[PDB]
Design a binder for this molecule. Structure first.
Ligand code: HEM
Length: 393
């Protein structure tokens, strides 16, 4: 297991979050690696940990630094954006801010709608019951990312299988995951070679142009970013989408969106808040003693921010354990905050919105085909979600 506390059979939070928010807001936690870190669970603390300039990400690559998981995985690549500090991080963050500008993401809206229509159309004209994960919530983000990256349809499954292997640290050995990452990268390098200089207007072309014309990305940064964007845009989105649809169906609030589609934008934010798929996040190393709202974290003592625990803090969210698609106030931290705020947040939010728009439009009578306790879940602190979501109509 890679769960933060006891592995859980559903999407409910571990009781230690509420216990800690009440009586131990900044206390050590033993991570799956066996190393310790300070677990921040209150929203005020997590928000400061994510936004303060007095924390480092690159310091966690040092040999004696705490690690979240046992082994030497791929979050140790010094060319990964999540492992960088300013000024290097600043340069690449500025490149990505232009590439993912609201104007540029809006230009990708039609492809997002086309892929969503295709997959919902296939469900609606097919047999029932169906597993909505295999037929929709899993394929949709990876197909979108593959389209935006100029990947042929025939290769989407390889990308899905490679990503699943690389992120499933407890399911495959390091040799297997290293091998998949080597294929992934190798494919992406050949993709760039066949794509560069041909005048496309996709995400992949904007990344290539940043390297070739701007000289604002190195070759290793370009290749690593392209792989990361695919992996992040696929798994995290797919997990939030499956968790959110399961919760909509179990609470009966799917019907709320069918009858009042104007609620879908607040529903997307509430799904992000309530089904935040990572109980824990990337560690932050204090580069000096940092005064947080609940206490001081010492220089050199790494902090785990829990965005999921922050997302249920009653100081910020009234009735935080209630799922309410009409919730007006929803400043969740599911996309993080500060320097490493999700670079794809606009695209991810739009995908979720269009998924719910299209499912409720085409399949208004959708309902669970099994009792929710028959569904198996992933357990790990970096990504939890249901394995299947059987539905019918
Ligand atoms: C629902 C979907 C998603 C969620 C909940 C999510 C969440 C996050 C979070 C929490 C972070 C910051 C991690 C930290 O600071 O420790 C992050 C970073 C990032 N996300 Fe997203 N993500 C989602 C979708 C996407 C999509 C669609 C893309 C790209 C197409 C993307 C690209 C990135 C990248 C590149 C970073 C690193 C930014 C940096 O370190 O400067 N994500 N994401």
């Amino acid at each position: 297991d890679s769960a933060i506390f006891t592995p859980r059979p559903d999407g409910s939070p571990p009781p230690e979050f509420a216990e800690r928010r009440a009586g131990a807001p900044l206390a050590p936690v033993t991570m799956p690696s066996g190393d310790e870190a300070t677990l921040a669970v209150r929203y005020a603390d997590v928000h400061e940990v994510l936004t303060s300039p007095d924390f480092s990400r690159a310091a966690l690559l040092a040999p004696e630094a705490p690690r979240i998981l046992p082994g030497e995985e791929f979050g140790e690549d010094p060319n990964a954006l999540t492992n960088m500090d300013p000024p290097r991080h600043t340069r690449i963050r500025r490149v990505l801010a232009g590439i993912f500008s609201p104007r540029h993401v809006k230009e990708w809206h039609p492809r997002v709608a086309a892929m969503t229509d295709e997959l919902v159309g296939a469900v609606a004209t097919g047999e029932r019951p169906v597993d909505l994960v295999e037929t929709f919530t899993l394929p949709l983000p990876i197909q979108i990312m593959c389209e935006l990256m100029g990947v042929p349809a025939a290769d989407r499954r390889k990308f899905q299988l490679w990503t699943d292997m690389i992120i499933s640290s407890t399911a495959f050995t390091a040799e297997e995951r290293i091998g998949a990452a080597g294929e992934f990268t190798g494919y992406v390098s050949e993709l760039i070679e066949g794509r560069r200089g041909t005048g496309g207007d996709a995400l992949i072309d904007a990344l290539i142009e940043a390297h070739e014309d701007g000289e604002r990305l190195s070759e290793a940064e370009l290749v690593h970013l392209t792989v990361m964007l695919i992996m992040a845009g696929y798994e995290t989105t797919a997990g939030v989408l499956a968790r959110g649809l399961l919760t909509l169906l179990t609470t009966g609030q799917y019907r709320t969106l069918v009858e009042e589609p104007a609620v879908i934008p607040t529903a997307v934010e509430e799904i992000l808040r309530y089904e935040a798929p990572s109980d824990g996040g990337l560690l932050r190393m204090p580069t000096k003693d940092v005064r947080l709202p609940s206490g001081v974290v010492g220089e050199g003592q790494a902090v785990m921010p829990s965005m999921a625990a922050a997302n249920r803090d009653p100081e910020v969210f009234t009735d935080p354990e209630t799922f309410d698609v009409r919730r007006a106030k929803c400043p969740h931290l599911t996309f993080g905050q500060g320097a490493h705020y999700c670079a794809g947040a606009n695209l991810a939010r739009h995908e979720l919105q269009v998924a719910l728009e299209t499912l409720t439009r085409r399949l208004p009578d959708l309902r669970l085909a099994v009792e929710p306790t028959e569904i198996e879940w992933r357990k790990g602190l970096l990504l939890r979600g249901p394995l299947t979501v059987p539905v019918t109509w």
